[PDB]
């Protein structure tokens, strides 16, 4: 039933189509704009990494280990596995008296083609540090170590870290997080399906502080402001999240999830954004978060023009010929 949110053209015709859902919620919980089904439970995957970084800050670990915005950004990141990402994750772990062996996420090659070419040339195999979640896992291990909680088995459903993350994420989103909503993430931690409406509300609360206690309100500001200050560390070279946060420095928060999830926030407008490409395609979610953010910057021509470049992405073939476009539909008007 979800509307067609993205078209992919070739010649004079639409070659492929994507359906999806978009929730835009203010800090008080009012729905500002919606497309399609924002009530059915959806897996946020990596899109809610900023929510999961709150124990790192709220525990006092970030302060105890003298982390700045680059380590905060990396803990909120789906990074490319570039040398800067690896080194920082290694550094975050070392400051907690730990190494790569403490990571329980496993290893993978970069999903970014140019970075995988760099990795393939310089490595026999990637390590846990090269995992896009290695920053988030580093932050988890630091959160544990700072409070003298054994980080071994931190991925486990009833490890006190995962108990803390449920409690935090239920408070932010007002969603029920439990066994029936639970799945295993690519990094072997729990991911909880919840309505896009609730996920949007969670990010609006972090962005605005509305309904949050002072410590949580402050920790949420530090994380959102870190990602916007150090956008390379959230993603990296050639990535949409990094480029989208260089359009309007310090003003727009975005984060991708696996399976075509995007979360975003505009703290100055007090709004949180969540969305899902029903088929899970990254290119669709990317076109959709751009067209959605653009609705709020129509009277800022240069920002609007920069966002609309991601909402209407040209495709060139191997000879650099324009063959067609990836275009958000009129539903974003």
Report the interface residues with Cl ion, using CB under 5 A: 45, 171, 185-186, 212-213, 216, 258, 317, 323
Given Cl ion, Zn ion, a copy of itself, none, residue 51, with its beta carbon under 5 to 8 Å by kind, binds: none
* Number of residues counted as binding a copy of itself (CB under 8 A): 51
Torsion of CA 33, 35, 40, 41, to 10 degrees: -70
Q: What are phi and psi of 261, to 5 degrees?
A: -90, 140
The token pair that represents 219 in the structure block: 């920790």
39-68 footprint of a copy of itself as x/- string (CB under 8 A): --xxx-------------------------
> Considering the complex, what minimum distance in angstroms separates the CB of residue 180 from Cl ion?
20
Residue 187, interface with Zn ion (CB under 5 A)? yes
Q: Which of 148, 214, 321, 330 binds a copy of itself (CB under 8 A)?
A: 321
Question: Binding residue per annotation — 37?
Answer: no
Reported in sequence order, the residue ranges of the chain that DSSP labels E, i.e. its strands, are 4-10, 13-26, 31-35, 41-42, 182-184, 190-192, 194-195, 253-257, 261-266, 271-277, 312-316, 322-328
Q: Which of 70, 91, 280, 313 binds a copy of itself (CB under 8 A)?
A: 280
Query: With respect to a copy of itself, which residue has the nearer C-beta, 182 or 312?
Result: 182
Residue with tokens 């530090």: 222
Contact between residue 25 and residue 201 where contact means Cβ atoms under 8 Å apart: yes
> Considering the complex, what minimum distance in angstroms separates the CB of residue 148 from a copy of itself?
26
Residues 6+ apart with CB under 8 A from 182: 157, 190, 191, 192
Contact between residue 132 and residue 77 where contact means Cβ atoms under 8 Å apart: yes
Question: Binding residue per annotation — 124?
Answer: no
Residue with tokens 């907690």: 96
> Considering the complex, what minimum distance in angstroms separates the CB of residue 30 from Zn ion?
31
Question: Binding residue per annotation — 241?
Answer: no
Residue 323, interface with a copy of itself (CB under 8 A)? yes
Chain residues in the site for a copy of itself (CB under 8 A)? 8, 10-13, 15-19, 41-43, 104-109, 113, 116-117, 120-121, 131, 180-188, 191, 193, 259-260, 277-281, 284, 317-321, 323-324
């Amino acid at each position: 039933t979800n509307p067609v949110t993205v078209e992919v053209t070739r010649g004079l015709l639409v070659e492929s189509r994507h359906r999806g859902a978009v929730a835009v919620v203010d800090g008080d919980g009012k729905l500002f704009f919606s497309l399609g089904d924002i009530d059915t439970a959806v897996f946020p995957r990596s899109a809610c990494k900023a929510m999961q970084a709150l124990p790192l800050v709220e525990s006092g670990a970030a302060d105890a280990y003298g982390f700045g915005d680059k380590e905060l950004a990396l803990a909120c990141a789906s990074h490319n596995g570039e040398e800067e990402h690896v080194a920082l994750a290694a550094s975050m772990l070392s400051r907690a008296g730990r190494n790569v062996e403490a990571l329980e996420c496993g290893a993978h090659w970069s999903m970014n083609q140019k970075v995988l070419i760099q990795q393939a040339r310089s490595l026999d195999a990637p390590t846990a540090l090269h995992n896009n979640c290695s920053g988030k896992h580093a932050g988890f291990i630091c959160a544990c170590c700072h409070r003298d909680i054994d980080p071994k088995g931190y991925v486990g459903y009833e490890h006190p870290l995962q108990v803390e993350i449920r409690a935090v994420m239920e408070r932010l989103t007002g969603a029920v997080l439990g066994a029936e909503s639970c799945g295993t993430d690519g990094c072997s931690i729990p991911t909880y399906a919840m309505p896009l409406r609730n996920l949007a509300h969670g990010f609006a609360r972090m962005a605005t502080g509305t309904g949050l206690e002072p410590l949580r309100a402050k920790a949420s500001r530090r994380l959102i402001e870190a990602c916007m200050a150090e956008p390379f560390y959230v993603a990296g070279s050639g990535r949409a999240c990094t480029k989208l946060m260089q359009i309007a420095p310090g003003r727009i928060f975005v984060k991708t999830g696996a399976e075509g999830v995007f979360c975003a926030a505009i703290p100055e407008k007090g709004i949180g954004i969540s969305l899902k490409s029903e088929d899970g395609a990254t290119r669709a979610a990317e076109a959709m978060v751009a067209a959605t953010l653009a609705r709020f910057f129509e009277t800022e021509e240069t920002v609007h023009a920069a966002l609309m470049a991601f909402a209407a992405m040209p495709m060139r073939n191997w000879n650099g010929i324009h063959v067609g476009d990836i275009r958000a539909t009129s539903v974003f008007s």
